[PDB]
Structure formats: structure tokens, C-alpha cells
Ligand binder design. Structure first.
Ligand SMILES: NC(=O)C1=CN([C@@H]2O[C@H](COP(=O)(O)OP(=O)(O)OC[C@H]3O[C@@H](n4cnc5c(N)ncnc54)[C@H](OP(=O)(O)O)[C@@H]3O)[C@@H](O)[C@H]2O)C=CC1
Lengths: 277, 263, 279, 279, 263
């Protein structure tokens, strides 16, 4: 559905690389329609992106001039410097998609609006699994984003994962759930593998089994019309190994730790922004 | 090049062991150890400044402003003033010295005691008027006693929490590891030696490896074995979270000390 | 100073420990890579191909390793050792020194198996660790009933080329396993966590890893070159009111010291179990 | 060596600290009991009658203590000190050295009050503890703005007769309060608990109390006469595998060390609050 | 009277400092310290027995049976064999020695390192053939380096848990107290001195007092004050229960060691 559209990344780190790789693997954009810029790009990222077909430049202004959709994939405190640098180069045609945690549409529009009125701004929160086209993305549309800009954004990010529109005031909470969530999963998978190794499994097999168990269970829940508590009941046979293991999770307050984590990440996201303003 | 001190012993021993500085090219302002090594010693902090090209400030965060008020009139355009004082900001030094002559060349250093065996961890930040070659000279000199790299000043608190306080974390761990060896039947001297050799060897393995520390943990924990059993008991006590707590607590205290220096 | 540079070394097992020792010995230059042979069941291991790239001879036949070797290291999971000793017992010759690195496996259990084939097998029990790969291992050994005096000296000379090495009574080896055998894994865990702490406080992860590892290496070296107690070095570096003593307090409040005692004890007890489960 | 045996000493307050110092001074023989006067609101205290039996002069009038004294100790609850200084400020003479043992009460707050009456009051701030009663106190002092050089020496000579004594900067006294000021109560608590442990394991309570107190006295003396770190002495006395290292493990698992850090900190912070609540 | 050793240094230093024994009347089987004090030294454990009247065994619980098998033929009717070896029961000593001559006079001692400054805590139990005057002589000799009293042998495990391990508890407490002093701003050397002086003074106050330790706690905790605030934080961590745990753990380990000696 995207024939001539070109995409740019300001930033070439973990998230920009994941999105660019997922977009190209999706085939929704020709790789040569993608440009990425950063001032000191790691030579291994240069090599991988070049082999992918992505165009590269140190000059953010070239990315702006190449792009129709412009992703801001720098650290949150870098956003206002970027907006000052490129603000005079924003055109009517641009959609500016901020991926930065915490950074409000309001703050981006106030910077850009000093240069040309009505910047079209979308704020999104995604996660690194876009790199395997299983990301979880939400976006909120800015004051001057045309209704079709949101639709275009959704169609584009839907090619690398789940994607849905939210009110901007949910994004910090999403950040604490699906933005940080992969790190919770990787922590859990490392520990589950340690557990399998303690009970006699080779590490390589433990890592594989644990990751496959998690992927399968998550897919079961997504494809099920059932409450996760009901799936827990379905697979916990009376007197069995699983309900014994669930008891030891409950005794250490397992559930409360995950709630603590979502809360901690969301709150930190709010604090950082309140320091930015 | 001449170097002066006003952690002081550790760097002078490390420098001289490195052969980067002759001992006598170094004046100071513990005394029998320095005099033995060949280090000139003087009580009058003013003599140290007149003698030196690169001037280290190794005094408590409380004794820096009084050191600067004393020797401020004596700083020349040639000097590089390198501050290792915990929590003393570049701003508070420049502010004091600028009253005497403008554009003082100031570098803030965050190093640790293992420079004394030339295995320190050092970062430095360059001040307003430090020329580019001043920071290159600093890196070259401090690289002779360990790792050295440049950082922004606003990361020195974090570095303090990690490699600044780090050796104390390790000394604590080695004392406890030795208590464990002794509980299980080892003589104390053997337990201390083995535990310290295990930490050094593991740190070197990581430093020479292109591998994540978790990957090295994976590689050495055989299935069902003694090591994975022991890792589990570490995990059940929240071992990892305590070390995060420590880096955080030391970094945060350093920010409080920077606040006092800036007031 | 015994001459051993021309002798042949075999490993039964081609895993992490065999790789580590073979790498350390060849990097020390004390043995030629073609003097080393290793046998293993599974060849599609990363360690089998690493041995191959070093120039070590690889084979699936344990007898061939035994016939090649003068010094024979046993570096397989413990419960495997009786099946190995049954398989190769008839191939042990008078020239062989058998060096068991199998954790928990006692000299007695080895000598009992091997004695059924030839009397007076020369056996040495070894406890070492993976940092021999960077020539900073921590190794202890105990000599068996028929080990000659020069066997112990040869073992000490060889293993000193890749780190600290000293003779102990056999009844210490289980505690050594809990301390320096498992010790590197405690250190890797600590370094991961310290780097997470550095990242929490604003450092890039690569720098935090480097700084934390350098801090631990340097502190460990300081202690080894000091004649001082680790508590004295802790005292010497903790300035009044400063950042370090504040961090040490939060370590103490979580019982940091007790966790490391708990770990040494747990590893040592598990090592004792593994022997008892064998016997 | 200053001569002070004939001088007169007053205490405003007749509580535990006044009793302890008066007892310690008289037991050291450095002052005559009739040279000491103490004033207090309530006379039906056990400490008032103990002072009486020692031969100390007791009175309800703080002015009379001031007129009697050359050295004047303030040993009342802190919030009382401003009302005392208002009451007796006009009676301070040039001969007086005022020695405040009120915890937290700063030299500044005292000098400000007393300066309204006569300029240059000679003030010393003291932090001591109850074991001066057995001449084993731990005392520090800081000299005020108008304290002569000999005032500090006189104070050190006097307080050294009842224990350790040294001069400090005033900004250490709050931390000293948390450590050796409160320290005896930590020790009494520990001794009660250790004796309960002895009773649990079969000892009669009287013996357990004696053995535990003697163990602590002896260990403390060993440390003071050693040039060694307490961790080194801990190492020296903990035999491998033995009873002591097993007990030290259970101490560590409850975070014993952190509780004592917590206590010093809590006492020091409370002392800082009490000054701030005053100011 | 002649005394021999085969904790050994601590008693010999304490005895000689006490003037109860001339240094040369003592033979032993750390070496420069003893030789300096005037203590005869010999490698051959047999020479020590021939020299001595009262014979101390200061070796690991593991090295006692081999010491007894060595010198057993040399024990005479005059000897009192005093064992300080941790966990070695009177029964296991008498059993070994009785093979050589019947009725060996054996005393089991539980003392601690502060005998080196003559403030030890010692209990002793008399063996099957120890005459009444043997235990009186023991009490008189050990009273010169600290407290000494007789107990039943089945209380020595408890005493071990309390005053045997006690000094290690105190060294640990003094290190932590000093960390606390340092955290709050004190120099380390001052913090160590003050904390040790506070413990010594408090222990002496209790020893000289006719008062319960809780009464002394009450007497020194002023209402609302710094001390009662600090006691509360001790209570919230279960401080008292940890010390009970410690005495129990050391006593129980001593019973396990007695079981090994008796097997
Ligand atoms: N990683 C994740 O899981 C997620 C990240 N995000 C958000 O995405 C943004 C980036 O995250 P991440 O990719 O992890 O951070 P990285 O640190 O991995 O990459 C940061 C990038 O910003 C670049 N950069 C810095 N200054 C400039 C500049 N002046 N002009 C252009 N590029 C510059 C860096 O350049 P150089 O290459 O020269 O260093 C680097 O390429 C953050 O705001 C984060 O919140 C959102 C969801 C999840």
C-alpha cells in the first residue's frame, strides 16, 4: 500500500535498527526507501544496515530531505536538540513520529511550531520485538496530524506487530508494560533456564525450552477467548507438579513483583518527562 | 614533566612503578614510604605548586576550598589542576581559581586505589578552559596505572558508585568468601588467596572475552552441579539487587557531596 | 624444575574445562597443541570446534586418548567417571598419571576402579577453574596412594603455568570447589549486577561492564599484593561520610556477606552429595 | 600537667550522668567529694541520694551551684538548657568554664545565650558516657570561641582520669554520641541477649552474665592493646570448620553488622534533630 | 612448677605477663615472639612432656589423637594433661592415655584469646582421675589470666557458644560499630577506639554492678533521646535473637565436634 513513501530515522541505535529491520523483512518498504542518520554510528550497525539496503548519512538534514515519515529514535533528552536542528527543514509533507519514551506531543509541537506552523506529529511507544515482526505498538496523534496520518501510521506499524491508537495519557503506562516488557521476559527466561540447569538440563536446551514455553503460552492466551486465570486453572491438575510450582511463586509474591515493575517503569517515565519540562 | 600532590600515595606509587615518572620529579604536601620511593616531601602546599606542571588535589572535599584560597595566587597559565577530591565539582574549583587568574585549566578525576598495583579504573572530565591536549595528556598519564577514559562530568557520580567504591565492594566480598571457605574447613590464609585469585581470574576472563557476563555464568555452570546450586542461593537472597543498591547509594551520596561543594 | 615440554596430554571430555586448560597450556607455551588429544561423545559442540581451531587432536574414542597420553585429565560429569574407568582401565599403563578434575570424585573411588586392572595407578585429584584460560586460574591438587613424589611436583609445575597452584590434603577439595571452583560464577553474577547498577545511574552498559570488571580485577590484585586483611583494605578506602561507606551500609543491610558464605557452603555441600550419590 | 585538685566543680542536673562523673572523679581521687555541688528539681531520685551518700553537696538552687563552682557541668535534658542559661547567665563569672554535656546542644547556642550577660564566656562541649563511673569512660570535647588554651588542657586532664579522652572538632560530636555515647546501651542489650543464649544452651543465668560480660571486656581490651584490625582479630580466632565461624555465619545471616550501623546512625540523627528542634 | 604447650601463644604471654610463671619454665612444641618472651621452643613433642608438670594440648581437634599416641608412653603419674582442643572430650583423651598407663589426670579447658591481656574467660572440667587438688591448681593458674571457674563437662559446649566464641562476636560488632561511626563522619581510627572503649567500659560497669543488664539499659536511656531511638532500631532487626542464635549455633557445632572425638 506504500509505493513511493520514504521513511527516515533520526537515530541509529537499538530501536531504529529493530524498526528498520522489521520493516524491510515485512516488505512494506523497499530498503532503499529507508535512510538512517546518527553522528557516530557503530561500524557494526553501518555494516548491517548497508547490507540490508538502508541508506546512511551523518547529516540529519539529509534524512529529513529524503523522508516522508520521519522517526525520531534518539534518547529523550536529545529530542529538543534534534528539533532545533531540523525544525527549519520540516515541510508540509512530513509526518514526525517520535519514538522517545516520555516525550510529550505538546513539547515537540511547541519546538517545531517556532519554525513552521502545524507540524504533523505522532507519538508512539513500541518495543524491540518489531525486529521479528512481533512488536507491540501504540500511538497517539498530535494537534495537526491529519486523520489519515494516524491511519497511515497504524498500517505501517501493523506490519511489524500489534498496533493500536491510544490517548496520549496512556503511553507512559504502555511504556511500563510492553515497552519495558521484553526486559522482564529476558530476565525471566534467564532465570527459568538457570532453573532447568539446576535440575539437570544442558543450558542450550533449557534456554530453548523456556523460550518456547513462553512464546507458546502467550500465543495460547492471544488466540484464546479465556481469562489468563482460566488458562492457569486448565493446565494445573489436582495434586500435580504445576500447582506445586505455582504455590512457590505465590509464596514469594511473584505477581506483586510484576505489578511493581510496570509501576516503576511507568513512574520513572513520568518523572523523566517532568524533569524535561 | 613535573607532578605534584596536595589516594595520593597510590598514584605516586603507581606512576613510579610504571616508569612514566621519575620519583624525584614528584613533590608532595606514609611519609617514610614516599621518601623511600624517592618522592620529595614538603609541608608548605605553596612549594608544591611552584614545583609542578600537573597538580593533583588529593584532600578531603572539605579541605579543597582552603587549598585553593591558599595557592590560588600561585596558579600560572602552565598549570593543569587535576582534582581527585570526592564530590568536588569542576564549577566550584574554577569559581575559586578564577578569582585569582582567569581561565584555570581544571580536570576532575575519578580514580581508585588499585592504581597502586597499576590496575586502576579512572575516568576524567575536562573543565571549561582545559585545552584538548590537556585531556589527552591526562588520559596518557592515567592510562599508565590502569584503565582510563574521558566522561562527561555528570557521569562521575555513577562511576564513583561503580569503580570508585567498587574495590570496597570486592574487599567485603573477599572477606565473606573467605569466611565461607573457613566455615567449610579451609585455613584462613588459603581461603583469602583462593577467593582473591578467583575474582581476579574471573574479571580478567570477562575483560579479555567478547562475551556477556551472563554468557560466562552460563558457560561455567554445569547441569545439576555445585555452582548452579550456589548461584540459586545467591539469587534467593537478592544478591544482584544488593550490588545495584550499592552503586545507586554511592552515586546518590556523591550527588549530595557535589551539592555541598556547589553551595 | 622438571622438564615436561615434550610430554603428551589427554583429556577425557572436550567441554569447558578441557578447552580452558588446553587453551591456557598452549597460551603459556608450556605444551605444544599437537601434544594434546581430547575425546568426547558429542562433536557438534562449540568447545569441540574451538579445540579443533587450536590444533588439539580430537577423537570419539577414549582408548585412543589414553594410548596417546602420558598425563591423562578426566574432565567429564562425575557420574560418568565409573563408566569411563571401566572402559579404559585395561589401557592404563605404568607411565600414566591420571588427573581427575571430576568434582567430588574421590581418589579412593578412582584407585579402587583402576586397581582392578593394574596395581599402583598414579592418581592426582585436581580442583581448578575456568580462568586458567587467561592464565589466572586457582588450582589445588592432592596426590594419591601411588603417586610418586615427582608426580606431585610435575602437576604443580604444569598447573602453575596457568595460575595459582598449591598442594592440599584431599579433604579440603570440596571446600575449595565451593570457593574458587564456583567462585568465577559468583563474580560473573556480581559483574552483571554491578553493570546494571551503573546503567541505572546513567552509564552506558559497555562502559559499566568495563569499569566494574576493572574494579574487581584491581581490588583482587591489590589484596594479593598486600599483606593486609581485606577488612583493613576496606577500612583504608572508606572515607568518613563518603559515598563508599554509604554503599557498604546498603550491602550490609541486605546481608551481602552472608549470601556469599551461603554460596560457598551450598557449593561445597552439593560437591559432597555428588560423591555420596556416586558411592 | 595542670594542677586542679583544689578546684570546685558543679553539676546543673543530678541524674545518671552527674552521678557517674561525680563517682568517677571521686573514685579516681582527683577531686574531693566536698568540692562537688549538684542541683536538681526533684530530690526523691535514687541519684540524689547516691550523690548524698558520696558526700556531694546537693541544693535545689542552680545559682548556688554556679557561685560554688569553678568548672560548671550542664547535665540536664537538652530542651531545658535555654531556661537554665537564662536563669544563671547573670551569675557566670570570668573564672567559670562552662562544660555542656547536653547532647546535641551546640557551643553556638550556649555562647549566644551567655554572651548577652558577660562577653567571652568560656564554653566546652563534652560527649561522655556512663562508664566513667568505673573509670573507663569514652569522652571527647570541643573548645568554644573564648576557651583559653589551658581550658582545653584542663578538661582533658580532668576527663582522662575517668577514661579515654581526646579533643575533637565540634562537628564530630553528634557522631560520637551515636557510637560511644549510646554505645553502652548497645552493649547492655547485647549482654542480656548473650546471657539468654547461654541460658538456652544450659548455663545458669548468673554464670552466663559473668562469662558474656568478661568475653566482651576482654575482647575490647585485646583490640585496644592490639595494633590490628578487628577483622584480623576475627580471622585470627575463627578456626576452620569450628564453632565460632558457625556462629558468625548466623550473625551475618541476620544482618548483625547492619543493625549496629543502623543504631549509630539513628542515634546520631536523633542528636541532630534535638539540636534543630532547639534552634 | 613447669608448664608445657603442644591460643598456645595467648596463654604463655598471659602467664608470663602475670608473673605467675617465669618464661623459661615454659616449653613449646609466632616462634620469634615466644623466643623473645623467653619461652623455650622444641620441635619434638616428646621433649615437651619430659620437661613439664602441667601439660597443655593446644592443637586442632584433629591433631590430638596423634599427639596422644605419640607421647602416651611418656605420661607419668605426676602429669596433669590439660586439653584446650575444641570439642575433644575428656573421655576420648582418657581412653587414649589409659592404653599406656591407667589413671591419667586429665582436665578439659575452655578458654579464650583475651587471656593474652589477662582478661580471659575460662572454665574447666575435671577428669575421672584428676585429684581435687588438681582442679584447684588449675583454677589458681588460670585465674591469673582472667575469670576462671569449674563446670560440669556437659556445659563446656554452652560456654564455648558464649565466652569461647564471644570475642569474635565482639570483634564483628566493633568493626560494624566503626563502620557506623565512619558513615556518620568519624575518622576510622577514632571510631575503632571509641567503639572498643565503649564496649570495655560497659562490660566493666556490668561486672562491677549488682544490677541486671536490662536495668543498666534502663538507667542510661533518657526519655525521647538518641539512645532509645537507636535501641528501637536494634530491636526492629531482632538484634537480641541474633546473639541467641550465635550462642546456640556455636554450642551445637561443639556438640558435633564432641561426637566426632567420641567416634
Ligand atoms: N531500546 C528499546 O527497547 C526502546 C527504545 N525506545 C526509545 O527509542 C529512543 C532510542 O532508544 P535506543 O535506540 O534504545 O537508544 P540507543 O542509545 O540504542 O541509540 C541512540 C541513538 O541516538 C543517536 N543520536 C545521538 N545524538 C544524535 C544526534 N544529534 N543526531 C542523530 N542521532 C543521534 C545515537 O547516535 P550514535 O549511533 O552516534 O551513538 C544512537 O544511534 C529512546 O528515546 C527510547 O526511549 C522506545 C521503545 C523501546
Amino acid at each position: 500500500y506504500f509505493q513511493s513513501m520514504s521513511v527516515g530515522f533520526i537515530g541509529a541505535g537499538q530501536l531504529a535498527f529493530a524498526l528498520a529491520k522489521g520493516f524491510t523483512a515485512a516488505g512494506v518498504l523497499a530498503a532503499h526507501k529507508i535512510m538512517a542518520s546518527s553522528p557516530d554510528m557503530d561500524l557494526a550497525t553501518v555494516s548491517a544496515l548497508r547490507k540490508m539496503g538502508v541508506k546512511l548519512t551523518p547529516h540529519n538534514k539529509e534524512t529529513v530531505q529524503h523522508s516522508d515519515v520521519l522517526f525520531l529514535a534518539v534518547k529523550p533528552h536529545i529530542i529538543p536538540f534534534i528539533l532545533d536542528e531540523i525544525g527549519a527543514d520540516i515541510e508540509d509533507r512530513h509526518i514526525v513520529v517520535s519514538c522517545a519514551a516520555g516525550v510529550t506531543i505538546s513539547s515537540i509541537e511547541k519546538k517545531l511550531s517556532a519554525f513552521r506552523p502545524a507540524p504533523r506529529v505522532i507519538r508512539c511507544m513500541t518495543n524491540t520485538p518489531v525486529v521479528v515482526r512481533e512488536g507491540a505498538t501504540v500511538y497517539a496523534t498530535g494537534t495537526h496530524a491529519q486523520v489519515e496520518d494516524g491511519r497511515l501510521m497504524e498500517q505501517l506499524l501493523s506490519s511489524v506487530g500489534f498496533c493500536t491508537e491510544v490517548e496520549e495519557d496512556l503511553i507512559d503506562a504502555v511504556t511500563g508494560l510492553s515497552g519495558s516488557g521484553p526486559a522482564y521476559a529476558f530476565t525471566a527466561l534467564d532465570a527459568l533456564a538457570d532453573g532447568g540447569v539446576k535440575m539437570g538440563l544442558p543450558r542450550r536446551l533449557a534456554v530453548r525450552l523456556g523460550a518456547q514455553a513462553l512464546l507458546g503460552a502467550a500465543k495460547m492466551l492471544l488466540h484464546s477467548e479465556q481469562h489468563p486465570g482460566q488458562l492457569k486453572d486448565n493446565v494445573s491438575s489436582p495434586g500435580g507438579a504445576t500447582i506445586h510450582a505455582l504455590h512457590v511463586l505465590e509464596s514469594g509474591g511473584f505477581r506483586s513483583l510484576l505489578i511493581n515493575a510496570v509501576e516503576a517503569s511507568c513512574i520513572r517515565t513520568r518523572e523523566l518527562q517532568s524533569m524535561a519540562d
